[PDB]
Design a protein around this ligand. Structure first.
Ligand SMILES: CC(C)(C)OC(=O)N[C@@H](Cc1ccccc1)[C@@H](O)C[N@@+](C)(Cc1ccccc1)NC(=O)c1ccccc1
Lengths: 99, 99
């Protein structure tokens, strides 16, 4: 992976057998994804972003594929503009910032 | 830099004669700074994201120094809890995502 920023950093992910588009977003601590149905038990959570508070469903230990790299972790699902991959998963697959 | 993501990617920036800390953010299109007074003319704007929309003022042709590097361009000022360096400035300093 070398990704330059004249365009948004948008990738494909695979989750639950599904194919979605997501954004690699170094200023997000966490990963937040649009409304979907995922297996298992979930915890409610409120998260604050710059324009206010949103409400979320926490799922733990979920397998995702990002660009051919496999990861296992927490995913929050809720009312976000785009799909967001945050630092929790970016670190799993080996991502860094460079200059 | 090489910059890893175990924590938040905070750098030092200088604007005016001011010393600030700010986030390197590949998820941001634009550069969003905290409340300050700047030389020049500006226009208002509505920008949105997690939680909703804020109101902002657009300045053009601002010089900023970020980690030792010169950039020049557009900053948006308004009530953010955090200073974010977006892709408009990030490209000027040679910044890349790797993988
Ligand atoms: C999702 C969460 C809460 C984990 O992180 C963010 O929302 N991160 C912000 C930056 C930030 C950092 C620390 C505390 C609070 C906020 C951004 O990385 C999110 N981002 C880029 C999302 C986005 C992406 C594409 C288009 C729209 C929104 N920016 C914003 O949500 C945002 C909102 C209002 C104004 C400026 C930026």
């Amino acid at each position: 992976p070398q990704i330059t920023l004249w365009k948004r950093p948008l990738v494909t992910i695979r989750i639950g057998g599904q194919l979605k588009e997501a954004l690699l977003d170094t200023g997000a601590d966490d990963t937040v994804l649009e409304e979907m149905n995922l297996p298992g038990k979930w915890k409610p959570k409120m998260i604050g972003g710059i324009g206010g508070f949103i409400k979320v469903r926490q799922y733990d230990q979920i397998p995702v594929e990002i660009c051919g790299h496999k990861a296992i972790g927490t995913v929050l699902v809720g009312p976000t503009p785009v799909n967001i991959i945050g630092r929790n998963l970016l670190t799993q697959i080996g991502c860094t910032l460079n200059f």
